[PDB]
Design a protein around this ligand. Structure first.
Ligand SMILES: *[C@@H]1O[C@H](CO)[C@@H](O)[C@H](O)[C@H]1NC(C)=O
Ligand SMILES: *[C@@H]1O[C@H](CO)[C@@H](O)[C@H](O)[C@H]1NC(C)=O
Ligand SMILES: *[C@@H]1O[C@H](CO)[C@@H](O)[C@H](O)[C@H]1NC(C)=O
Lengths: 114, 114
């Protein structure tokens, strides 16, 4: 498995213009982003997929803003970034799935809108 | 760079109830990007026995150090075998996507209980 630096939950108020959900793999050894696949899951569906082999990101219509900092992937950072509009309409537990070659793992972070 | 082969050397394994069973699987390549999963049975009702992402899977222990990038041994040990554990176990390679698609399956290992 890929191993994670876990986080129970994060928060963001109305003042938070953009929302960041932390995901950090600790035993990542990817040589190129082509080796990497990232899934951010929410209520079953994939609200964001990064396909490194194809170098493409896929999002549904509701999640028009969701993206990650691809520059950070090789470091093991697959944190998710979205605006306030997408955040409020989708509040709950998030699953961060990362795959490197054949190794895979996931971890859960709950988004709270206090 | 050649197409991965999935090798389950044992066509069949037998074991007394309450005891453990080793299910061997090795692959020849770590490509393409996507995980290995163990299933019992084939078809739409097959049962997920193990993967790296959705654990821990009680009763299932990995034979090798599967947190290592270069690991190609996906053999597992299943403890406390019951008659319910009987059937054919498939070590299966998947490609990433929404959803992940099955890329190639091992021959299968027939377990039976004494
Ligand atoms: C990553 O892999 C692609 C495709 O194989 C290649 O074109 C690119 O040069 C690689 N990037 C680096 C930094 O090596
Ligand atoms: C990912 O896409 C960007 C923009 O389209 C491109 O500049 C970059 O080379 C791609 N990364 C690869 C091919 O590793
Ligand atoms: C998030 O998951 C936990 C279980 O670990 C659950 O108790 C909680 O209700 C979930 N949050 C939502 C918004 O469903």
């Amino acid at each position: 498995q890929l191993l994670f630096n876990k986080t129970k939950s994060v928060e963001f108020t109305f003042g938070n213009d953009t929302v960041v959900i932390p995901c950090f793999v600790t035993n990542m050894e990817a040589q190129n982003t082509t080796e990497v696949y990232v899934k951010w899951k929410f209520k079953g569906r994939d609200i964001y997929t990064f396909d490194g082999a194809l170098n493409k990101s896929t999002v549904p219509t509701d999640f028009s803003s969701a993206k990650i900092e691809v520059s950070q992937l090789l470091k093991g950072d697959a944190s998710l970034k979205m605006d306030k509009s997408d955040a409020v309409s989708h509040t709950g537990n998030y699953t961060c799935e990362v795959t490197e070659l054949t190794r895979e793992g996931e971890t859960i972070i709950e988004l709270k809108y206090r | 760079e050649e197409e991965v082969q999935i090798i389950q050397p044992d066509k069949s394994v037998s074991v007394a109830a309450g005891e453990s069973a080793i299910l061997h699987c090795t692959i020849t390549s770590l490509f393409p990007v996507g995980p290995i999963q163990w299933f019992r049975g084939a078809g739409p009702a097959r049962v997920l026995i193990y993967n790296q992402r959705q654990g821990p899977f009680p009763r299932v222990t990995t034979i090798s150090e599967t947190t290592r990038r270069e690991n190609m041994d996906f053999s597992i040990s299943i403890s406390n075998i019951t008659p319910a554990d009987a059937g054919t176990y498939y070590c299966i390679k998947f490609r990433k996507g929404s959803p992940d698609t099955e890329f190639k399956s091992g021959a299968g290992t027939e377990l039976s209980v004494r």
